[PDB]
Structures are given as structure tokens and as C-alpha cells.
Design a protein around this ligand. Sequence first.
Ligand SMILES: Nc1ncnc2c1ncn2[C@@H]1O[C@H](COP(=O)(O)OP(=O)(O)OP(=O)(O)O)[C@@H](O)[C@H]1O
Ligand SMILES: [Mg+2]
Lengths: 468, 128, 40, 41, 193, 577
Amino acid sequence: LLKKEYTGITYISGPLLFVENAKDLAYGAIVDIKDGTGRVRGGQVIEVSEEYAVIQVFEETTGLDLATTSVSLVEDVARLGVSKEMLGRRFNGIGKPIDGLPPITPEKRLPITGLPLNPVARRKPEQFIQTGISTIDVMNTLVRGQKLPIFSGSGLPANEIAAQIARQATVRPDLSGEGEKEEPFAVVFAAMGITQRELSYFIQEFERTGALSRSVLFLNKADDPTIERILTPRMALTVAEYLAFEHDYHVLVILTDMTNYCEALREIGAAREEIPGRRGYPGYMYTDLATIYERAGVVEGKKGSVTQIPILSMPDDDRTHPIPDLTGYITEGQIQLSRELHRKGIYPPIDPLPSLSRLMNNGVGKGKTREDHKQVSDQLYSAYANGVDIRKLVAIIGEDALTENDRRYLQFADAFERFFINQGQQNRSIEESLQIAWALLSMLPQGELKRISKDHIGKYYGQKLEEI
Amino acid sequence: ESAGELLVATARTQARGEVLEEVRRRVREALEALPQKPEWPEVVRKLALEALEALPGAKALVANPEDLPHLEALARERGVELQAEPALRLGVRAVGAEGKTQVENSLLARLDRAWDALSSKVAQALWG
Amino acid sequence: TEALLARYRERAEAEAKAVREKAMARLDEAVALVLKEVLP
Amino acid sequence: IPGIRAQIRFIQQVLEQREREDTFRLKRIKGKIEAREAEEE
Amino acid sequence: PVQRKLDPNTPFLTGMRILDVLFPVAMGGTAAIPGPFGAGKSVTQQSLAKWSNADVVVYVGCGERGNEMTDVLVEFPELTDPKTGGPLMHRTVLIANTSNMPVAAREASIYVGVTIAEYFRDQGFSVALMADSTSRWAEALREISSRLEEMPAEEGYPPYLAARLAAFYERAGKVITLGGEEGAVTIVGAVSP
Amino acid sequence: MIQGVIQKIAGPAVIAKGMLGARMYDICKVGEGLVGEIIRLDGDTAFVQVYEDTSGLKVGEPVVSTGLPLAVELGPGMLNGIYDGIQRPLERIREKTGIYITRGVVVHALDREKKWAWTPMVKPGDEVRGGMVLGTVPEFGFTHKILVPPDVRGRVKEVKPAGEYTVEEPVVVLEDGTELKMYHTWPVRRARPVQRKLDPNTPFLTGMRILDVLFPVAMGGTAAIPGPFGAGKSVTQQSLAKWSNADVVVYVGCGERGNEMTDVLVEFPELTDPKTGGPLMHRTVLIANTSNMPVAAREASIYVGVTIAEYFRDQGFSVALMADSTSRWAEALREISSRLEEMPAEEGYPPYLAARLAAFYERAGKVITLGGEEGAVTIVGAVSPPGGDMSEPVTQSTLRIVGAFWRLDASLAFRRHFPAINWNGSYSLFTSALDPWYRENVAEDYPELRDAISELLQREAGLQEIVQLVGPDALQDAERLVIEVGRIIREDFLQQNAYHEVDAYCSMKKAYGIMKMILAFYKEAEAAIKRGVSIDEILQLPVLERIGRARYVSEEEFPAYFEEAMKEIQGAFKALA
Ligand SMILES: Nc1ncnc2c1ncn2[C@@H]1O[C@H](COP(=O)(O)OP(=O)(O)OP(=O)(O)O)[C@@H](O)[C@H]1O
Ligand SMILES: [Mg+2]
């Protein structure tokens, strides 16, 4: 094709510049800015009019001038270019390779914003995922096609939990009873605002256990331009959905820090001078977050699936901050970390009381897992709640007033936080997690387990202490 | 264990990249030999016609001084000013009426634009 | 048994040379095909 | 003490939001008066 | 238009003990259910749509998740209508406009739902209208106003939001239709502060 | 050369007409010529932000654009010097103008009159790439290497012979006509290119036992400290500068108050380099800004300092960079943002404060230079929020990207405990990466000893309620033993005198020996308690004096003392029976 250059530059200030004679530029197009020194920047058309078209520069505008600068059109819609050979590679936030390997050959080029999924074409998520963590596997079961963010703090180890989930994720098709062949499992890992230390830790974690073979990495650093932070989740989700819905893959998408993405969005919106929100964030933040989160799910008639585990840090542990508050309004639950358990040295420090999985009811039961899953989940939740109530009662009126049941529940809660949650680096299976759950459920009398049915009692109520 | 698999994968990737770059270099060198062909005036006139079609109302057309006599006849029929430029090799550029919009039509630019689209075809031709 | 990487290195060399030889068969055809598309 | 701290932070957030809204309205009126004085020619 | 508006004197049985006992709502009344995320607005509205004594149910997914609409589409044809034999999905009309769908269509979704409810009331039935989230409609209004560069009132919302909400909620009530028979519309709207 | 005239003056903002073709962020001379910066272009009009006072200017005065953005001069002559925020030597300014800094004065960062002993290391016809070494110049005991600018390629045509030359002498001429001098310019807002960035697997030895053991920082890492009054921050910083691994130290003031800056300026010249007899200033660069200096200098001082550090590590050294108060720099950034009428994000700060902080802090690291040699930058930036609240946005943004946090506390200094780092609040994230290095170079059991010491301190801190309610004498034998072991740890391992001749610096071996001695004594005391010995008898043993005097023992004579103390520890318990 041919090349068009626009040199009618009229006004440059901050991150914006105006081109006056560019009626041919479509809204939202991607352009290339070239200065007198030969350096080429990137830009996006955020507004087009007869008088001029407003272009937002990706990088800084240093070195631009009204005499020699020229603007050229790249493409009307932002296309990435994807192929099945991207597995095992390592790209930055913009999609260029960063591992030193030569560029890939694109099988197809797709828009990065994607399209909304027709609700008629969707289907209900039904199959569980074994994350290898007892608290997640038993009480907050993760289902294929779910968005399950993890809420963390400043010093809490979110990265370690994310890496552990990536390493230990399995589908367990044999438990489904159908005995079909194992489907391919892939991990798309998008990183935003990541320092060198975190990047090195992630690279070493992926290379140590060989998990990089079935994984694609989108790693955007902290010193990278701001706009690259915006595009990284869209590139990652485009690749994930392409693989899932054109190669029957089961894809797990992990986003390292949505707080950095929200900060970049706020900075860009302030640069464009939109209507402010609750804490300076743009008013359309909910829509922007939805356009990323809603891309996960399962589609009728296809075997692929997309699962998302966003990671974010709550500022000052404030659950009412706009970022976690708006994130919760979209996803199907949340996993919350506890600083008290971190001070106790528990790992992973997941607090089960404020955690919830909305799709757990459909992804567990007979055929999917062992048929006692829901009952034992309810029983452990009730017992832990009673233990916490006893703990709070002790901290006011003393230990003297405890009944034998109360102290039994107290010691059960202590053993629970010492064994069930504090698993360290164990890759506990669903069978092992259920065995441990039954083992400490035997600590209570048979008549005290009101939620569990009589069929499972005796069948599994072996009154056995923990073997670990 | 996975180290050997990664090594063979990167060996195959490097081989594919090297052969694709070899094809690209051969094509680029072949394009450099186009002006020596007898069809050079015809193809450059066609490129100038395409550029002028893509830019309605162009006030001028610029090209190579060697190629200027070739497009002199086309300049008269199209009724626009023409001028020479030594740096504009293997191409022709159209200048808009206001002088702020430019439309460029050159072999190297077309190759750079279409290489990404044609890479898949080249790969499937080389490896079946 | 730490010297098992030699087999993989030899396989990598052999497969690289095999890919080169296989792709060398249609080099001129590929060049002509892409030149036909690039040209008007 | 924690209840008082929560009330204090809530009040601070409310005041900051009101200040930001006032600043945005000031910028809006400045922009619109500039637009009027520019388009009046 | 309607002939006349009557006074509500019969309860809207939601099928839930606490709502039906402590805080009942009469046929033709309006109720609001605000709460933070995870409180259970959608589950409560689905339970209302599955067990209420309304002849026709209109469900409006104004800017909410698509999985919740998929769950309805999958499950409702299996259940049975309590008031009359046959699958429940023949009782329900769905207006689906998910979060990732265009923002400006949420207001149209709300108005289309309320108009369909009014029509089915005019046929003489007792219709229940459920709005999944009106906060998304308010956000769409705010965005459209911000494009117009109008003066915000507070938190960026347009000054006429209250008038729009009042006009939307006033459409409910037990009325005498122009055909000379009784019908009613009940509106239950969720808010997400 | 773009030239224009003043069209409109309003405060520090100057509008110039006829400036078509001016680049976006060039530096301009406004007036007869005050230094400014283009921030906006519109037709033939350019907006200039003048750094200094604009009173007295008139419409129609010339405006000249230099055609380059803000940049620093990198070359010999920077050591032992003091600069302002935009690299203007203060000594020559004082010589020229007196005690005041008159506006419009111009001086050169590098002295153009001094002569240096050139020593070529390249030959004619040799290809040269960006970052290669061209020669050698001695400077206060350092081997200052003249480096090719990173964006220069070519081959050498001629090279001057060894002799005396100034920094403006074109020592090497390339075959394309390019002339290479002893110095070059680099924009302060662009990071210098590197071949590769290495992983943090080597430690940054501070010389303080608490920082070197409990909260380590890797070579090329980032650390942050509070700055409360009365906590002895200045002496800690001076000890760090004296006893660090870094060959070159860069100090940035960035807008501190006048008297504190005066103290810093009068204290370093009196410091002595531990490695020689000369003062420490021969390997130190000072950047000083008072709170009444122009805001642009205060904002650009951080970038100037980090760029100088990047250049010095590109020469192949290890550099420690200390930002004195990033809160003042954040305040200056907020003021500049408010000058542009930008929308504040939270508590008045601009929405891009976190991005700027990350861009500054991410220049640190250990990298392979373009010349193939190893270098690193370690950044220790202090934050001093007003009121000491840690919820202030600058502190929150800083704690999300730093690798270490050494919480200085005034309470510890009040009870005469130094260097007064609170071990309850401090933390570090470089332990896991540094464990193999500790195993290789210190001892195979070093992580176990460190974890044991940390656990003992944690247990001691856990009992503080009871010892405060009922007193120490009401406890059992184990509790009293724990309290006394914690007291011994605090008084003999964490504590350190900076002014002491031999106690000022501690190697890893001495700290390991002290920790092992303390743990062995704790084990012996617990065994004696288990054997029915009274706590008072244990608290009166004579080997405790040997343990207490361990930190005052010379480094070379330490192993014999450690062996004798280890023998006495086992002798004192078993022989008494
Ligand atoms: N009556 C109920 N019985 C059992 N579980 C319930 C009930 N109501 C709510 N829940 C639980 O609460 C979860 C959250 O409910 P729901 O999704 O309806 O909340 P919401 O207020 O609509 O949320 P959002 O703000 O995210 O749209 C459900 O997935 C379910 O597990
Ligand atoms: Mg809901």
C-alpha cells in the first residue's frame, strides 16, 4: 500500500498534538510521529474534527517541533498479530520480543479491544480447577471460566502466591469420571509496573520448574512508557482468547498488579482532562475494567476456556478504595489476604471469612469432585466461625467461662490455622486437602457435625489424626 | 530436561528467521535491479498514476531526475507541476494542494508495508 | 549421566540443517511469488 | 479509637472530594470564558 | 395513558420470609435494594423472579454481568411456573446489556423494559419489573453529560438525574386500564453505592 | 539557530513570537539571558518557563533557543566539587559574584583551564563503539577513563600523543569528521543504555551490623529511611559513606533547609577516607539546594545526581547514591504541576508522582556496561514526611518499589541506643537472593544463625507486656533468661559506636562470630537452667564480659579472641557443674 504523511502540525502541549488537514484519519486510529532526528514515536487519535484531529502521543513529546514533524497512518484499528508459536516466548507490554529471539510469524491479526461475547453463546462454568492450595480448593473452589481476584496489601506476598498457583495449576480430568484425554493447559502472564527484582524473581520461578514451556509472558516494567501499561492486559487477553477459541486450550490469565493499571488510567484521564471520579480516577473506570475482565468465560460449542486471576493491592488495607470496590463489582468473588496470619507466620495468609467464590455451587459435587465437598466446606466454615467467636469471647471475659465445647472449638481453630492454612510450599491435592479436612473434623464429636450428612460420616469419619 | 526442548525450539526458530531474512534480502536486492529493466518507465508511470489517484487535487509531483523525462508525458496529461529530486530513488511522491499532505509511492515502502502480510505466505511456501 | 545434552545438541544441529535444506528447495519460487505481490 | 479513626478518614475523604469538585468547576468556568472570549473575535 | 390509578391493597408475595413479613411491598409499589458488592442483590432479584406471584416478569440487566443472564437463560426453561403449569421461561422477558456492551444503551434498556412492562399491564396482567442496577444507568448519564460539557451537580452526575429517576419510578402502580380492567406494575430497582 | 522576541510576559511565563521550528523541550535564553524551558508550541509562538525572577523584562527583548534539552557535562573534574541543582559550581560562582547568587550568571560545570595527563589506549584505524574506552586521566587516585558517547560509532583516524591537555581538546578524530573530547553531554531525563541488567545476587556491605545482617541490601538495590529529628540520621549517612563498598559517593540535597545544608557542607570536608589518609571528598560529588533556590533546580537535582552516578558506574565502578529528602523534591514537583494548572490527584500531588518516583528509582541496578565491565548504582533515598505519618502518598509510593526499609526511630536514640534502627518496623526483601552468597563467602550456617537471632529478638519483643505490667523479677527462669539474652543481644550486637576507632566498621566474619557466641551462650544457659542452676548465678558469669568486649576487638586479632571466648563459654558451664 501507499504512505500518507501529514505535516499540518499546529499545536503541541503536554501529551497532545493537533493535525489540521487529516480528515482521512479514522477515530481511534494508530499513527506514527516522526521528527527531524529520524526517531519514530507512536500515537492514537482520540478525537477527529474538520478543523483538526487530536493525537495523544504514547511516549514523551520531547524533541518535537512544528517545522519538521510529520504524522503517518499505521492502521485504522490496533492489531496485534498472533500465532500458536508464541508459547514459551517473552514479550514486553507492547508485544515486541524481549528474550532476544527473532520475531514470530503471525498466523492472523486481531483487534486488541476485542468484541463483547453474546450472552446466548455463553454457557455456565461447570468444571473445577485444582490450584494446590487447601483454602482455595476446599472453601473457595475455582471454576473454569471464572474471574477470581486476590486482594493483597503492601508487604503481603502476592507474587509468591501467584507463582505457586501458576506452578501447581492442574485440571484433574480423571476425577470427572469421563476419562477423556487431558486437554492442553496454558498460562498467559501479564505484568504491569514490575520492578527488576520482581521480574528476576518471576523469570527464575518460571525457569526453575520448566513451567515456561507452556506459558507466554507479557512483562511491562516500571520505567516503561505509561501507555504500555494500558495495552498489556488487552494483548494478553487477545492471545488468551485466540488460543482458547481456536486451538481448544484451557488458558489461565494472571495480572500482576491492577493498581498500576489504575494509576496509569488515572494519569491518562487527567492528561485528557475528563470528569473526575471519587479519588481522581476517571468516571469511566468501571467500564474500562469491565472491558478487560468480561473477556473471560466459556462458549457453547467450544472446548476452550479462559480463567482470570487478577492480583491487586488494597491501599492501606482499605476495602472501600475505588480500585478494589470497583473490581469486586465485576468479578465472581475475591480472595483476601490477612496481615494477622502474616504476623503469625502463616503461609499463604488467606483469610477465609471475607473470601467468597460465587461459582463454587456449580463446579463441585458428584462427578466433578468428591460428593462431600460442599458439606465439608460448610462444616469447616461453621467451625472456624465458632472458633473465632470463642476467641473474641476469651479476649474480654477470660478463659474461665469456656465450656468443654468452647475449648474444643478453640483448639480446633488453633489446629486449623496451624495445619489447613499454613501449608508452606506443599502442592496439596484435592484428595489430600479433603483428607486433612476430615482429619481435623474428627477432632469434634460426631453429633456436633450438624451440616454433614450421615452417609459421609463413618464412610470417611475415621477419627484419624493428621499424618503430617 | 526442558532445556534440550527449548534448545531445539530456538534452533528451529533461528533457522526460520535466518531463511526469512535471506528471502527478504534477496527480494530487496531484486527490487534494486528493477530500474535497469525495459519496463522501468512503465512501472514508474503506473506508480505515479496510482499516487496521483490516491491524492486528489495534488498540485505537484516529484521524482528522480533520471525518471523525470519518463513522467514528463504523464505530467502534461494530468495538468500538474513536476520537479526532480535525487534522493527520491525507485519511487515517486505526490504533494497536496496545501503543501501539508504528502502521498509517497516507492518500492521499498510497499515492501515494508506488505512484508508482514506476506510473511505467512512465504513461510507456508517454504515449509509446505 | 550429565552428558545427555550432547544428543540434544546434535539433534538441534541436524534439524536446523534439515530445515535449511527443505526451505532451500523453493527459494526462487518464494522470491518470485512475493515480488509478484509487491509489484503493482 | 478505631471508630474515631474511621470517622476521621471518612470526613477527610469527603472534604477532599468536595475540594476536587470545586477545583474542576473553577477550571471549567475558566475554559468556557476563554472559549467565549476567543470565539467572539 | 391509563383510565385511573388505584390504591395498592394486596401484597406482592416475594417468597422470602423477611421481605414478606417485616418489610412487605404491595402490588404496584416500588422498592429499592441498595448494598455493596457481594451482599446478594442479584440472588434476591432472581429469587423474586422465580417465586413471585406476578403473571409476567420483566428482567432488565442494565450494565451487569453476562454470566448472570446466561444462568437465567440456562436454568429458567427447566423450572416450572408456580402460578400455572409449564416451564418458567414462558413467563419471563429478558433485557440484556452487559458491562462490556456499549455504555449509551443502558438508558434505552431501562426505558424499553419499563415500556414492555406497561404494555403487559395494559393487557390486564400483574407485571413485576426488576432493574439489575440503576447506578450503571446513572453512570451512563454522567458520561453523556460529560461529553456535552455540562455543569455537574455532585460527584459528576448531571443535575437532572433525580428527575429521571422519579419519572422512571412513577410508572409503577395498580391502575384501571383503558380497556376497563385492573392491572398493576411492580418495580424493584437495585442500587450499587 | 532559532531566534525570537518576547511577545507577552505574565509572571514566570514568557511567550515568544517568531520561534517557528523550535524543538519541544529545548533550553532558551530569555532577556538581554535568563535560562528557560519550552513547554508549549503553537504556530510561531512558544511558551517559555523562566527559572529565575522575570522582574525588569520588557516586551521585544531577544529570545534565543540553545537547541538542546537539559543536560549535564560528563568528564574529568567532577570529583571534589559542589554543584547546585542544574550543575553550576558554587565555588566559582562565589568567587565571581561574592556571597549572593546574582541572576543571569553563567559558568561551566567542568573547568576549562585545568590540564590533565592524557594517556591514549587506542590506535589509528581501530573501530570504536559507544561506551568503549579511549584513554586514561588520573584524578585524585582514580583512573578516570574517557569514554565514547553511547550514540557514536566509527573508526579512529588520528589520536593525540600523551601529554597535558584541557577537556576541550579533541583528543580523537574519527574518519567521518567527528571530534571526540574529554567530555560529552547527556540529557538528564534519558537513562544511559546498558548491555544487560544483572540479578541482585551480591551484597552491599554497609559496615553496620544491623543493616548488614538483619536487613541486607543487594549490590544495586534500593533502600529508604525515615528522617525524624534527633535520630542521628546524619552520622549514619556519614558512616555509610565512609565504610561502603562504593568507590564513588554522590550526595543530593534537593531542597533541604539552609542550616542543615550548611552542616552537611561543613562536615564532609572534615571527614577522612578510611582507605587512605586523604579526605573523603576526593571521591564524593555534592549537589546542594536550599529551599529558596529556583524550583526547577530543586526538581532536576535528583535527575542530575542519578545521571552522574550512571556515568560513574559506566566507567566501571560501584556508586552509592543518597537522596537526602525526596519529600522536598515531591513538594517541588507539586508546585511545578500547580504552575501548569494540572488536576491534583490526591492531597495535591500530581497523578504522575508514582511514575516519576519509579523512573528515578529504576535507574539503580548492577549492569554490564557497554565496555563489558561490571558496574552498579545503589540508591538510599530518605523520606521525611511532615508529622511522621506513613500514610502520606510519597511514602506509600516509595514503599511499593524499594527493596529495603530501615526505620530510624527517635525513641531508641532517646535511650542512647545507636545507630537507632527499629528492628520491629524495618524489613528487607533481598535475603532469599543473597542466601547462596552468604553460604559461599561467610559460612554454611549463616542463614540459620540469622534466623535464630531474629526469632530470639521476636520472642523478647513478645514478652514486653508482662515485663511492663509486673516487672522482670516476677517472671520464671525461662522468661528471665529470654529477657537477659535479648538485652545482651541489644547491647553487644545491634549497638555500634560510629566514632570508635575499631568499632566503626564490622565485617561479616566478626558479626557471624558474635552471633555464634551469643547462640552458644544461650544454649549453655538454657541447659544450666534445665539442670537446676539459678538465673542469678548465670547472670554473674565472667564470660559475659568477654562477650561484651567482642565488638571492640580488632579485625585481624578477632579470630584468636573468638576461639578463646568459645572455649571459655563451654568451660564455664561444664566445669562448674
Ligand atoms: N439467599 C441466599 N442464599 C444463599 N447464598 C446467597 C444468598 N444471597 C446471596 N448469596 C450468596 O452471595 C453471593 C453474592 O450474591 P450476588 O451476586 O447476588 O450479589 P450482588 O449484591 O448482586 O453483587 P454485585 O454487587 O457483585 O453485583 C452469591 O453468589 C451467593 O453465594
Ligand atoms: Mg450482582
